[PDB]
Write a protein that binds this ligand. Structure first.
Ligand SMILES: *[C@@H]1O[C@H](CO)[C@@H](O[C@@H]2O[C@H](CO)[C@@H](O)[C@H](O)[C@H]2NC(C)=O)[C@H](O)[C@H]1NC(C)=O
Ligand SMILES: *[C@@H]1O[C@H](CO)[C@@H](O[C@@H]2O[C@H](CO)[C@@H](O)[C@H](O)[C@H]2NC(C)=O)[C@H](O)[C@H]1NC(C)=O
Ligand code: NAG
Ligand code: API
Ligand code: FE
Ligand code: ZN
Ligand code: ZN
Lengths: 6, 335
């Protein structure tokens, strides 16, 4: 449920 | 129209891309990076348009906004009247493979053995087996389960890279690109074939394509399928003919991703480029074959028959499937 790694 | 800038991972892919670009009259051009994640960042910056990705990488790319465009379609196990481009994709079988001679080894005795993985973050090589292992062991310390591994992309000083061999000079040990001897499906199966590892996490097709003369490469040319077994989750071992009933999961096919704003153009250019260079393409094998690389699966898997249209303009979670997505998310909680 979380965001872009970069 | 615009040119499509493909992103090649490592220098072997870059050489193949450069041949494609020359053949395509620069309809396709090439950017190159050292790893798949770095190619994903080039495409997020708009400095490349697209690349074809394993599903674990599609997850990374999809969390950052890139979308699936076309999927690899290999020869179907059933007859179909449909053109390859409109045939629904079937997904590949993730398996755990060992040598028949290594008689004691089953799924339930993998702890402290030596493993061979395609790369960290890839579906059959990593997300499916390590997801299953973290869940069955109730521990996130998956970096301490195998005594030593080759898992390209991991810390090169760690046990997860200790079996990786790098390039001819021994440089680039553990880099997640084709310069590493044990990278990818074929490299992880060669890591098992040479008895560097006890188990390889690959897909069913890899075992068939690199045994019984299906590969003429030096390390493969003499391998016999009957010398391998699959590890089934119920702790049994089967011949490699039994993958349908002895796999770890069914994986979504590798697929091309792009920024959303370039998807339509990428899709149109690829459908034309495979008409030229695809399997039975106008200009394959005379000039160039987009889906060959002497077994090294460069840019696309060598078993790709075509890139196929996706049904339902799917988001990356629809393409991967809810279950696979959830399994990844569970596993990445460990990191
Ligand atoms: C495991 O993979 C192999 C290799 O892709 C599959 O065998 C191929 O199946 C195709 C389509 O049926 C045949 O026409 C090819 O000739 C086979 N290749 C070889 C080298 O034998 C095999 O079907 C797969 N097993 C499962 C259960 O999917
Ligand atoms: C590892 O275990 C987790 C936790 O049980 C699995 O996550 C579940 O997946 C099922 C089937 O898709 C879902 O119905 C549940 O809602 C999920 N649970 C949670 C807490 O998220 C996951 O599938 C397992 N990983 C593997 C590779 O099998
Ligand atoms: C280059 O793309 C243009 C526009 O679609 C097309 O007219 C031409 O045939 C393409 N050539 C090749 C070799 O891909
Ligand atoms: N093991 C099952 C399905 C599990 C697939 C799920 N683990 C995923 O994340 O894709 C199989 O033999 O087909
Ligand atoms: Fe894969
Ligand atoms: Zn199954
Ligand atoms: Zn949808």
């Amino acid at each position: 449920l979380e965001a872009c790694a970069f | 129209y615009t040119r499509v800038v493909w992103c090649a991972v490592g220098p072997e892919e870059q050489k193949k891309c450069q041949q494609w670009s020359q053949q395509s009259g620069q309809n396709v051009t090439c950017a190159t990076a050292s790893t798949t994640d770095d190619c994903i960042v080039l495409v997020l910056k708009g400095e490349a348009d697209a690349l074809n990705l394993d599903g674990g990488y599609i997850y990374t790319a999809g969390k950052c906004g890139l979308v699936p465009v076309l999927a690899e379609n290999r020869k179907s196990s059933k007859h179909s009247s449909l053109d390859c481009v409109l045939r629904p994709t079937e997904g590949y079988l993730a398996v755990a493979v060992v040598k028949k001679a290594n008689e004691g080894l089953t799924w339930n005795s993998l702890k402290d053995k030596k493993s061979c993985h395609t790369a960290v973050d890839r579906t059959a090589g990593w997300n499916i087996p390590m997801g299953l292992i973290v869940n069955q062991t109730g521990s996130c310390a998956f970096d301490e389960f195998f005594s030593q591994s080759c898992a390209p992309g991991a810390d090169p000083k760690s046990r997860l890279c200790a079996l990786c061999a790098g390039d001819d000079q021994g440089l680039d040990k553990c880099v997640p690109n084709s310069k590493e001897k044990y990278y990818g499906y074929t490299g992880a199966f060669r890591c098992l074939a040479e008895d560097v590892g006890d188990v390889a996490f690959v897909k069913n097709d890899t075992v068939w394509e690199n045994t019984n003369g299906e590969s003429t490469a030096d390390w493969a040319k003499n391998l016999k399928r009957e010398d391998f077994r699959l590890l089934c989750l119920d702790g049994t071992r089967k011949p490699v003919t039994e993958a349908q009933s002895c796999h770890l999961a069914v994986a979504p096919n590798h697929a091309v991703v792009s920024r959303s704003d370039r998807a339509a153009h990428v899709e149109q250019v690829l459908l034309h480029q495979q008409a030229l260079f695809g399997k039975n393409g106008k200009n394959c094998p005379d000039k160039f074959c987009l889906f060959k690389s002497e077994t090294k699966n460069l840019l696309f898997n060598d078993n790709t028959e075509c890139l196929a249209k996706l049904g339902g303009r799917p988001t990356y979670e629809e393409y991967l499937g809810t279950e696979y997505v959830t399994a990844i998310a569970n596993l990445k909680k460990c990191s």
